[PDB]
Design a protein around this ligand. Structure first.
Ligand SMILES: Nc1ncnc2c1ncn2[C@@H]1O[C@H](COP(=O)(O)OP(=O)(O)NP(=O)(O)O)[C@@H](O)[C@H]1O
Ligand SMILES: Nc1ncnc2c1ncn2[C@@H]1O[C@H](COP(=O)(O)OP(=O)(O)NP(=O)(O)O)[C@@H](O)[C@H]1O
Ligand SMILES: [Mg+2]
Lengths: 367, 365
């Protein structure tokens, strides 16, 4: 393997009914590809640079970045690396009502990165479905809710108390994993769609002040893609095997407990989300400081999300993130925090390698 | 001058074991034989003077019935016609194939028929007006250190196990008093007598089988050569004799696992004792052949005492131990192997052959 950096992208969503009703001023502007922010105080205008910038604010202007465009700019390269045998990770970040549960999954009329990636992967595999390489796909779809793990592809029993919790455990080599996760086999995009629909029907959502359907649980969508390649060997064939993992992550939002006025369960889950995001920010800052040659420890273990995504934020995977921000003045502080974490995520690098899985058999040694 | 030829035969699976997928625990490496437990804890290694791996018909050196005969038994005929006494012992637990090797089927014969028919053939070839041959046979059994005959008709009684005695003729060595001896001219007669006797041989349905042998069977052929030589007159009476003995031993069997009370226990005890004395005599004979000064305890058991003149001296002894490769019979297998061994058992432990594919160490080198 060799060093590769985390691909950071940004997306400015358009005004919503709330920012229109309580009429607010546009503050986010794109200077070509830079993203600029003109504070109402007018002390200065901040300017942030990113590997990619997307302007889905307008629906007319040259620069309109639609869902297919976001796909063909971010997700297709990860599919290339997955076919190359690398693990890949993509995760969303942002505050409430920024469009993280839209960019990734999308609506029934404007699908997101998840359906586009799955369909494109299956189609490329069918195109390349020669007798040389036999392909296999497995999937899982789990969530995190008040620091508890839940399986989304497991239909709840005949009760309300059915969110049967699992637990995380560290395999000494493969790293963290979830015990009891119903991995399911994937033939094609239709079955993927059915499973995903069942999952999103099971996921924890709720209405609030700043969203009618907000996600109160982090979501991880994992694919395991196995290529068993045929080769002319003097003995038994089909030893060449490449196993690659794709991990797509829809996180929850910051949510100050004033705008999104809540009480009880809404508040409790709002607190847990906030703590998870704090730990994530600490991890990102620590990896950025690692990239500058200092000595730092990464608090992976302070939360289940970072624990189960340890090998992706750093570790061994081609990683990318999509920051989501609103263009209004009422969300200026959260926009700036998100943009700062995004830009200091760019300095992260991770050592991704091809997962040959032939250590101490013959082939990694022959290499 | 003598030497014990020790041979060990590993049978193949049967249809029942192949159906049940009974595992394999006996393996080969050329001459050596090994036992590797299913627990992967210990590896026992045995060496014998000859091995017969009848496990798979494809492997090179698959021991055919003809191979077994021509390797173990037939040189005994050479020594017999040379004028020297011979003994062939057969040992093996039930289910090992101790009969298939020795007596055999109607289609795949064994040591006994190949031996007898080759004997008849060589006799017919050597028969002239000057030299003649004469063959007598006897068939007795040993049960609780007592002798019985197998070639008489059971009289009209609840039991007619008439015992006999052993006596030491000062010249002819020991012998059995009152034993009937019959003349033979063909394998038809031999087969008829044997098929009569093996209905009288003591057998009972123990835990391990419906018919397990509880007596040591001795089948003796006395072959007399009458030749003539010039004595300045009528050439007459230059006489030689040779004794062939074929012994079928019974199985050991422990009585601590196989709970067994009464007559079964007495039988097993006597079997165990006779086999112990037999092993002592055999090892003493090996040391004598290797040149030490040794005392051979022929007299501590009836079988050894009766076969004294056919183990020691310028006589030729062979032993064939039959074993099964399955795992369920592993205690019997290890026991028979240890019994047949004459020099020493070798023991190691190894689980390092599985080198994760295609001998990984080669590319490491
Ligand atoms: N490019 C866009 N154009 C129009 N509407 C958009 C766009 N992006 C997001 N939205 C709107 O955003 C709303 C909520 O977005 P959503 O996907 O829930 O963001 P979110 O980050 O998932 N909120 P949360 O659940 O707290 O994480 C939807 O009702 C969409 O109509
Ligand atoms: N060398 C061999 N090759 C192939 N099959 C064999 C061989 N030896 C024995 N068998 C088979 O295994 C059977 C064992 O002999 P058989 O007399 O039927 O039972 P048994 O238990 O060996 N009798 P016994 O040994 O006196 O208790 C034979 O009948 C054959 O079917
Ligand atoms: Mg959401």
């Amino acid at each position: 393997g060799s060093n590769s950096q985390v691909t950071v992208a940004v997306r400015v969503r358009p005004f919503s009914k709330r920012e229109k009703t309580e009429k607010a001023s546009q503050v986010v502007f794109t200077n070509g590809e830079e993203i600029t922010v003109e504070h109402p105080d007018m002390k200065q205008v901040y300017s942030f640079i990113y590997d990619v910038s997307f302007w889905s604010f307008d629906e007319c202007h040259p620069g309109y970045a639609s869902q297919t465009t976001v796909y063909e700019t971010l997700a297709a390269p990860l599919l290339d690396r997955a076919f190359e045998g690398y693990n890949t990770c993509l995760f969303a970040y942002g505050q409430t009502g920024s469009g993280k549960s839209y960019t990734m999954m999308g609506l029934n009329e404007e699908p997101g990165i998840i359906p586009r990636f799955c369909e494109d992967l299956f189609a490329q595999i069918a195109k390349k479905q020669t007798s040389e390489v036999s392909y296999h796909l497995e999937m899982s779809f789990f969530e995190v809710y008040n620091e508890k793990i839940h399986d989304l592809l497991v239909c709840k029993g005949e009760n309300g108390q059915r969110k049967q919790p699992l637990r995380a455990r560290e395999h000494p080599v493969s790293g963290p994993y979830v015990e009891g996760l119903s991995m399911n086999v994937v033939s094609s995009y239709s079955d993927i769609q059915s499973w995903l629909e069942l999952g999103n029907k099971q996921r924890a959502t709720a209405a609030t002040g700043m969203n009618d359907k907000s996600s109160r649980s982090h979501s991880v969508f994992t694919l395991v893609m196995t290529q068993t390649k045929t080769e002319v060997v003097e003995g038994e064939e089909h030893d060449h095997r490449i196993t690659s993992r794709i991990n797509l992550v829809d996180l929850a939002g910051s949510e100050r407990c004033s705008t999104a006025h809540s009480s009880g369960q809404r508040l409790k889950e709002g607190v847990s989300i906030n703590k998870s995001l704090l730990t994530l920010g600490k991890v990102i800052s620590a990896l950025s400081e690692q990239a500058n040659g200092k000595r730092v420890f990464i608090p992976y273990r302070e939360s289940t999300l970072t624990w189960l995504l340890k090998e992706s934020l750093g570790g061994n995977s081609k990683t990318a993130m999509i920051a989501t921000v609103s263009p209004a003045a009422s969300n200026i502080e959260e926009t700036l925090s998100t943009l700062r974490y995004a830009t200091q995520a760019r300095l992260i690098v991770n050592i991704a390698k091809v997962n040959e899985d032939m250590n101490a058999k013959l082939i990694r040694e022959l290499k």
